[PDB]
Prior knowledge:
Number of helices of chain A: 0
Distance between the termini of chain A: 36 Å
Strand order of the largest sheet of chain A: 1-2-3-4
Number of domains of chain B: 3
Number of strands of chain A: 27
Oligomer: heterodimer
CATH class of the largest domain in chain B: Alpha Beta
Structural class of chain B: alpha/beta
Shape of chain B: elongated
CATH architecture of the largest domain in chain B: Alpha-Beta Barrel
Number of helices of chain B: 15
Strand content of chain B: 25-35%
Distance between the termini of chain B: 45 Å
Bound molecules: the ligand C[C@@]1(O)[C@@H]([C@H](O)c2ccc(Cl)c(Cl)c2)O[C@@H](n2ccc3c(N)ncnc32)[C@@H]1O
CATH superfamily of the largest domain in chain B: Divalent-metal-dependent TIM barrel enzymes
Amino acid sequence: NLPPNAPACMERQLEAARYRSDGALLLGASSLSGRCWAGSLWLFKDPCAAPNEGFCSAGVQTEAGVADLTWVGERGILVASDSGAVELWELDENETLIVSKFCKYEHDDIVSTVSVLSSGTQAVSGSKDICIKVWDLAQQVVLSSYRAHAAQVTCVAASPHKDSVFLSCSEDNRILLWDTRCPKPASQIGCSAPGYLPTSLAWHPQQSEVFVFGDENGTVSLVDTKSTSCVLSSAVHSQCVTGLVFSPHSVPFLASLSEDCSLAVLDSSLSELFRSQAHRDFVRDATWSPLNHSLLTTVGWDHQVVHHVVPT
Amino acid sequence: SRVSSGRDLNCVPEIADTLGAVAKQGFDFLCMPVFHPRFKREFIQEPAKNRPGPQTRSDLLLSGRDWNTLIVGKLSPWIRPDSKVEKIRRNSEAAMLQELNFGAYLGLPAFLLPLNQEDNTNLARVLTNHIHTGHHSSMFWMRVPLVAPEDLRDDIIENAPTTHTEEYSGEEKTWMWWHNFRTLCDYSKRIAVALEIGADLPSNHVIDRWLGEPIKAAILPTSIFLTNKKGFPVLSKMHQRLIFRLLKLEVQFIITGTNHHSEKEFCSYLQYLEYLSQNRPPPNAYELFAKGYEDYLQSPLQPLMDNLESQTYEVFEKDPIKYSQYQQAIYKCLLDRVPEEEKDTNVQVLMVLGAGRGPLVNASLRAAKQADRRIKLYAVEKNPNAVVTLENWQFEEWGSQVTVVSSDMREWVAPEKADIIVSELLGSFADNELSPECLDGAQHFLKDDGVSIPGEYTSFLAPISSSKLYNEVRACREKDRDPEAQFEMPYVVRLHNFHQLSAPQPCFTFSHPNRDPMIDNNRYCTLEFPVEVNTVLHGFAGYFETVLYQDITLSIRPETHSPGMFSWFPILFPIKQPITVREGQTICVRFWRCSNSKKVWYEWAVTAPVCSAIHNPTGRSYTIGL
Ligand SMILES: C[C@@]1(O)[C@@H]([C@H](O)c2ccc(Cl)c(Cl)c2)O[C@@H](n2ccc3c(N)ncnc32)[C@@H]1O
């Protein structure tokens, strides 16, 4: 047990699980119950040691919960707070401490979603306040603030290779394809008015004009921008689709999360390869090992860090 | 009283610190989640169902006192009882009951639920079921915006533009969200509005829809505040009007969102409302006293059937304008009847009919002196308790100038006929205390050329919207009578939270003396009220004007209101069922004055744009005793 100036105990509800280029594991966690409702960030250079707080590379407490986070390159961690703040933490040179560089209270409700753009100098945040904001990570400011949606913003996803493009989706049943180059930046896509609310988004890493979205009814769907309305889909989950993460593989696989507490893994026809009832509460993230493309790490609110070996 | 103000957060890491910080900023209360807003819970499907550990934080974190007074609960925003997904409806049902039940367990004084879409039918069913599970008085604040979020979204979707077409009905849609929800919940007095104000206000007609509605709270997001050059947060001229209007409805102000003015403290916003509160257009005499009686229903006085108490006389004697106008009316009448050449030889028989405790007898004397004319005065009063006051005045002061008569003016045999009869027998609907029948019975002892003061009076009606007063009336059901009787009787009420849908129009008029042979005081009157808004009709406001003499008048008709007579509140005639009225439509109402030997009463019906039942047929619910 070597807890190096970090919290003695890590909060039950794990929201975030993200592998860095080198294969070290970023964990985000919040307390959604009990006396104190706050959050913590953790680095585990030993993936298999987590979630144990003692066998820890680095860890710190945030004022409030962790709705979403992501890596800013290799040193940086961008955080969606309940406070309405987007905050940037980056590791010190030793990678033993995690220090706040900026905490900016710019959103009027919980920050629900955050994504780093292709360049890695800009990021977009989404909030329950219905706004979407584009951030200068250099100057620590909101460049642009958009009220495009009519309800809570659920998920925002930056384009792989375009610093001006990103997808958003909201409880107003809109999927907006953004492009900050157009004087009217957003564009609505998907026809059916009675189609179930969109809950998750993932850009295809190769085909930079294809993405997937999960609906609140467990359906995962494959969309081509050029194809538009023509779609392929599968009823994968019994409850909401929380998250969609593509593998680093050459012809990639799709991990799908759900509140049905299962993980799925799918090919590019959306047929079911793997399954996992491993989790006993909601599944909140999936991250593929850079080092072994067969490995897939999930975290849940059951506080399990399950390392899956995909048959591939 | 200074403005009552609360803070709205959707994030509380520690209750103790948060409440302290918020209290330190100067807020009267805190709106906060009672479960963590992101803590979605499963009630059916395993394994999520059996999630261990505490479902939220302990009640031991605050005193009962703090819970009861400082904390407004908030529904978790994932709870969507009207979702199109069955699993989400069933979970949101359980979760809403859970959170609402915890609110009750904590004894929270209020609890916030949003109306953020058109269909809240299931939300209403679950809230209604909760209201009818125990006898709690806890309030429900429906968070509903002036402008639907869809109608204030930035115009930045290239292939989905914001409609530039004016939509009169469309721009009012959020009122209909509220109307439908409170209709489904059958007008529960526990369900009120928390009206969320946006950056751009809508048209006045949209703000005018919320007139008469039970607004308990107004929510001001930080974002809508403009900045003073010095740096203080401020509000546009138009926003400052809405705030002034809302202060008159003594609503509690909630401030939501993060501090957008970084250099400034959060108490800065709060201090602006208090500043705005200090500086408001001054309230008149009948806006200052009437304070305490706002939308308070009372039985109209019947001083014929009943003997008024000493303190009732007192209240209505404290009105210098009433007496100064009566003094002036008698003054002008005496000079017209007694030429300067005859002043010392010609004594006028002035008779006060219903002389109360004397101040009108005094007024009649003050009139005769300043006119320099001689008067023989009779003070006729039926109330033997007030006759005690008169006869003590008559012996101690007035002398044999005043003959006190302890008699009904209809029964009294006069020794000599009168030149002037002076009476004070009017109510808020003029003839509702039965001045006509009273003076008619006294008419036979007025000289052929005699003057009645007052000479005429006229009643006025206007249609009103007030979901508030409708609910006040609804709440006047008594055991051992017709369960709808409360709707078939007039109330005296300082109409406060309401909307006048049309200019007052004259209803019934009476002239004195009534030389007319075969006198008939019964009346039938059709009124057509042009309405230029969408609204809901809950009843009719009654007023009156009286000509004492010539140009000397008293009025409680708002557009000609006498300066004072603040004590005289409007009459409310309710209707059993509210009637939807669309802009451009005519409200047709029909009023009857009806009678027999024993009692007078009103019947009324709306005949356009739909028909009501005739109210108070045969005076079954309400009569005025002869
Ligand atoms: C209240 C009264 O004193 C008085 C009048 O209504 C009044 C006077 C002064 C004030 Cl301040 C107020 Cl509030 C009200 O008229 C008397 N009254 C009524 C009918 C009647 C009759 N038919 N014969 C004789 N007196 C009559 C009543 O008892």
